[PDB]
């Protein structure tokens, strides 16, 4: 059973390139795509064994405008993620109108790679929020993915524009993308621009943009989160069996994430992950479900008694309308790497403080919507949605989302949100 990897737009294909480059370096695969000589890791989820003994990633470089794709292509990885299924815009209105017209050219690609399966069961997106090629086209594409394949999951590794305000329609592009995330998507692992930009200085400084640094952490987040897919284990060999414990009702489909390395024993990596400083994202709040992946040379005998000790001291809090816990995915650290021994734990968890992150952009929308403002002053808006109904519909849809997330923090969420 297999997972496809629809990396989208300029930012998403950079971090997607970094993701496949990290997976290439971690698996027994050359930059040529050919089996490396020292190469058991599991490839069928992510790679196709083409007739040259070419492990080709199940990719789609589904971009919209030209610039960085050529520099991805002319790399030493030119023929890795590439059986040539590639393809070829500033705001949500323009992007949606272009995601429409092309869609015969690209839907054939999805169907082509889907028919290249024994059983497909996932569409991992690398989606840039508020960016132009991410906005509109991505939102159109998100609706069509569930129309065409209503039994296949859409999971979004959304990189989120939490920062100080360049583009004036920036709040809208986040709101109108958030609408789809809040109903079409099945999971959203959210990564925060300021939290990563802070964490850069919190190990090795950057100043004006140097995305290639924070991208190293992003690649470790994707690789860590897919580690239990890419090796055997008694549990969590598949994406839905992993996601099921975290998202308890279908509207709570967003996850915050933590990562420790910013000798070892499990109790100290558990304790670290729990501290607020290590979360890569910026009224009572409580956890809903926590899962953490401990990739390392760890003795498994320690893992259970570490949970019990972390329970007894109540360093983590949840909400009592239902049971919950922290959940630990112990994994083998990857060989074919340098220093494949430093314990390097990651967490993902559903916690209700993410509601405030949405509420920030809601408040930014309300400021512009109670002002008079630059509502996408390009004719691809004015000839498309000059009645402006969709953003207010998106605003009441996210207001129901805020109310649902805050409703989750009461003892009577057995009643309706």
């Amino acid at each position: 059973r297999e997972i496809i990897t629809l990396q989208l737009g300029q930012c998403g294909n950079q971090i997607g390139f970094e993701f496949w480059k990290q997976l290439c370096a971690e698996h027994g695969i050359s930059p040529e795509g050919i089996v490396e000589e020292f190469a058991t890791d599991r490839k069928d989820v992510f790679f196709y064994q083409a007739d040259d003994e070419h492990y080709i990633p199940r990719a789609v470089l589904l971009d919209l405008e030209p610039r960085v794709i050529h520099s991805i292509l002319n790399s030493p990885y030119a023929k890795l993620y590439n059986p040539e299924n590639i393809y070829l815009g500033n705001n949500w209105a323009s992007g949606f109108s272009q995601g429409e017209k092309i869609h015969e050219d690209i839907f054939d690609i999805i169907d082509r790679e889907a028919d290249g399966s024994d059983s497909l069961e996932g569409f991992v997106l690398c989606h840039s929020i508020a960016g132009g090629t991410g906005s509109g086209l991505g939102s159109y594409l998100l609706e069509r993915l569930n129309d065409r394949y209503p039994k296949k999951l859409v999971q979004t590794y959304s990189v989120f524009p939490n920062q100080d305000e360049d583009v004036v329609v920036q709040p809208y592009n986040s709101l109108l993308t958030l609408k789809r995330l809040t109903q079409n998507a099945d999971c959203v692992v959210v990564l925060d621009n300021t939290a990563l930009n802070r964490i850069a200085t919190d190990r090795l400084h950057i100043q004006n943009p140097s995305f290639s640094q924070i991208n190293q952490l992003v690649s470790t987040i994707m690789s860590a989160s897919t580690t239990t897919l890419r090796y055997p284990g008694y549990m969590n060999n598949d994406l839905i069996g992993l996601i099921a414990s975290l998202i308890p009702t279908p509207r709570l489909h967003f996850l915050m994430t933590g990562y420790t390395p910013l000798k070892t024993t499990v109790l100290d990596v558990m304790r670290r992950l729990l501290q607020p400083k290590n979360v890569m994202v910026s009224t009572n709040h409580c956890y809903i479900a926590i899962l953490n992946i401990i990739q390392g040379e760890v003795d498994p005998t320690q893992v259970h008694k570490s949970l019990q000790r972390i329970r007894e001291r109540k360093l983590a809090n949840f909400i009592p309308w239902g049971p919950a816990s922290i959940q630990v995915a112990l994994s083998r650290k990857s060989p074919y790497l340098p220093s494949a021994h430093r314990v390097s734990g990651l967490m993902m968890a559903n916690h209700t403080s993410i509601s405030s992150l949405f509420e920030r952009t809601c408040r930014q929308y309300d400021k512009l919507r109670k002002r008079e403002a630059f509502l996408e002053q390009f004719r691809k808006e004015d000839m498309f949605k000059d009645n402006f109904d969709e953003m207010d519909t998106s605003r009441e849809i996210v207001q129901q989302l805020i109310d649902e997330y805050h409703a989750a923090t009461r003892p009577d969420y057995i009643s309706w949100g």
Binding site: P232, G233, Y234, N237, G241
Partner: protein, 60 residues
């Protein structure tokens, strides 16, 4: 010990038997649990060994 540990691979046989009879391999089990389901929905007199040995080998 030096014969049984490589002329009859005794330690690999323990390691493999844990991979299968104790479900340790994981992938073999997630895929076989899928492929095998519509067979095992039916009542037990309607199940025959040529379906089952073929679908095991297919999962392997």
């Amino acid at each position: 010990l030096d014969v049984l540990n490589k002329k009859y691979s005794l330690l690999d046989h323990m390691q493999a038997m844990r991979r299968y009879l104790l479900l340790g391999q994981g992938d073999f089990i997630r895929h076989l649990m899928d492929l095998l389901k519509p067979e095992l929905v039916r009542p037990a007199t309607t199940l025959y060994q040529h379906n089952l040995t073929g679908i095991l080998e297919t999962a392997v």
